[PDB]
Amino acid sequence: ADQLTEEQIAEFKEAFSLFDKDGDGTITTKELGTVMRSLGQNPTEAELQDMINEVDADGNGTIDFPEFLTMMARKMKDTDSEEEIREAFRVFDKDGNGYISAAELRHVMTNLGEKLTDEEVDEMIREADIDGDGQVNYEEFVQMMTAK
Template sequence: LYSIMSTAEQLSEEELALYKAAFGIFDRDSDGSITAAELGSVMRSLGRHPSDAEIKEMINEVDEDDNGSVDLSEFLTLMLRKTSDADAEEEIRETFRVFDRDEDGYLSVKELRHVMSCLGEEVSEVEAVKMLLTAKAKNGGESGSVSNSEELLVSFDEFRALATGQNWP
C-alpha cells in the first residue's frame, strides 16, 4: 500500500484516475494484475506503441515480486517512469528546435556556436566541429573530419543520441 501511495503522490489526480481506469479495464480476470499481452493493450490505449521486447523490458523493470505480471502499484510506477521519459524526449526536442535557428531540421556549426555563446560558453569553430562529429559518430554516422565546417549538419536523431548518451562506448 505504501508503494502505491508514494507513486500515486507523484502523479496528478487526472493521471492517477486515467491509469487506474486503464488498469481496471485491462485486468480482464480481476485478479489485480495484468499480463504482458494485457500491458500491450493498455499502452496502446494510452497512445504508446511498444514492441513485445519493450513490453517484456517494462515488466522486468517494475516486477518487484517476479511473477511476470504487473500489479497496480507496479503499473503506476511504470506509468510514472514512462511519463518522465516522454517529458525528457520533449525537452530534448525543444532544445533542438532552439538550436536549429533556420528550422531546416539540422544543426550546423554556426548554430551550435551561436547557442553556446548565448549560454555564456564560447566555443571555437574547431570545438563545435568536434562536438557535432561526436554526435554523428555516437549515432552510427561517420566520424573523422570535414573539409568545410559548413557542410557538417547533425539531425535530431543524432542530437538526441548525444543528449541521452545512447550508443556511447
C-alpha cells in the first residue's frame, strides 16, 4: 500500500533527484513527464494530464516520488494480471518469435543504455536460461523475477 519492491527504490530516488533542483521537496509537474522520460520511459501527455490531474488533487504544483510508482503499480496490477507478463515480451521480445534472443537483449540493452557483444550476452541469458539455448524464453525471464 505504501511501498512495493526495490523497483520503487530504483527510480523513486532518481525521479526525485532527476528534477528536484529547485529544492521544492518533490519534482515539478510540467517536468514530471521528463523525469519519467529521462528514465527511458515514453508516456503520453494526455496521461501526463491524467496523472497531473490525479496528483494536483492537493494543489501543491509538485509530485511525490513514493506515491507515483504506486500509481504505476495500480496501472498494471488491476488492468490485466495475465498480460502483465506478456508485456515484458513487449519490453524485451524484439524478434516477436517468442524468444528474446541475445541480440535483442543486447538491442534491449542498447535501447535501455548498454551495448552487449556475442560472448558478453552468454551470461545475461544463462542467468535465466534453464536449457541454455541462448534465447531467453518466458519461464526463464519469469523465474528470475521470482528466483530471488
